[PDB]
Amino acid sequence: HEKVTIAPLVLLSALDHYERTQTKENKRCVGVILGDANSSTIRVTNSFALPFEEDEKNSDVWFLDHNYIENMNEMCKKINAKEKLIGWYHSGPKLRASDLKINELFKKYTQNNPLLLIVDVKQQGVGLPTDAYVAIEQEKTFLHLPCTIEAEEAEEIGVEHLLRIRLTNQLKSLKGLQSKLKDVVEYLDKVIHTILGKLQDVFNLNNLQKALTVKTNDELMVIYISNLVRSIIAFDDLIENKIQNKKIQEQRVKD
Amino acid sequence: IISLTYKKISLRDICLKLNLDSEQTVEYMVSRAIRDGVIEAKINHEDGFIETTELLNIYDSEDPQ
């Protein structure tokens, strides 16, 4: 499928709009993103912040000002003519029921499929909390795409100024397992469909990995064979340094 | 040495090469070394020969690791 790539300028901007706005009482901060969604890799080069207010007890009441949409368009076209509105982002990982109503507001302004961006301001997860969903025909479903970081000298350089393998992956696997454990327990309390369909396919596709263990060790010893000649070459580097240091000792005594 | 030659060898033919006494003496000596994993074979009395239980093919095992 497609891919989502976001520069750290957009990631840091969405995370800094929570403290500046001083949003409290468990509310959300909605903002718009700019970029080019026409290619297979969506690149977000710009982001903004718009005022958003929605009632917690009533999900049928929402308000969004359209002046900021027309004001930022006239502002960007006078600066960067290659940037258009590809969608919008939210302030939290948890999805609400208003995602379908907000999608109808930008469908007239956006000339392509609206991109749903999800950014966690709390950063209570592991790895990259930022999520990217794509709304397509289901009524409507949200297809998620992997989010990456843009590699360029216009962004990552400023990151290096501010700031300055499997062990991390195993901790990420525990996060995915705990999500399925709580989903099954909470499902039984509400009773006594798409999740159960894909759950039985995981078990049948690590008890099954033991059948290939006979053929697994075939390429495992090759690593040790590659490491055997790897360690032998390491002696030629250390012994040559000993011979080099031995010649330095003779130069200091004769001096 | 004679076990590593042929996988299937007769019992009486062993006493002919080494000039042993009888078949009862060689019967104990073959089963004595397999305790420490030396010969690694089995003696078939009904068949009449001593078959070697070593098929090699350790490339599929974890022992060289």
UniProtKB/Swiss-Prot annotation, chain A:
Gene Ontology BP annotations: proteasome-mediated ubiquitin-dependent protein catabolic process; ubiquitin-dependent protein catabolic process
Where would I find the MPN domain in this sequence?
A: 4-138
Which keywords does this chain's UniProt record carry? Acetylation, Phosphoprotein, Proteasome
One molecular function GO term is: metallopeptidase activity
UniProt keyword Phosphoprotein present: yes
Q: Give an example GO cellular component term for this record.
A: proteasome complex
Record's comment on post-translational modification: N-acetylated by NAT1.
Pfam family name, one:
MitMem_reg
Record carries keyword Phosphoprotein: yes
What does the further note read? Present with 19800 molecules/cell in log phase SD medium.
The family classification in the record reads: Belongs to the peptidase M67A family.
Protein purpose: Acts as a regulatory subunit of the 26S proteasome which is involved in the ATP-dependent degradation of ubiquitinated proteins.
Name assigned to this protein:
26S proteasome regulatory subunit RPN8
UniProtKB/Swiss-Prot annotation, chain B:
Miscellaneous comment text of the record = Present with 16700 molecules/cell in log phase SD medium.
Output the PTM entry.
N-acetylated by NAT1.
Give the modified residues of type Phosphoserine: S61
- Protein name stated in the entry: 26S proteasome regulatory subunit RPN3
Per the record, the coiled-coil ranges are: none
Family per record: Belongs to the proteasome subunit S3 family.
Quaternary structure annotation from Swiss-Prot or TrEMBL: The 26S proteasome is composed of a core protease, known as the 20S proteasome, capped at one or both ends by the 19S regulatory complex (RC). The RC is composed of at least 18 different subunits in two subcomplexes, the base and the lid, which form the portions proximal and distal to the 20S proteolytic core, respectively.
Q: Which organism is it from?
A: Saccharomyces cerevisiae (strain ATCC 204508 / S288c) (Baker's yeast)
Function, in words? Acts as a regulatory subunit of the 26S proteasome which is involved in the ATP-dependent degradation of ubiquitinated proteins.
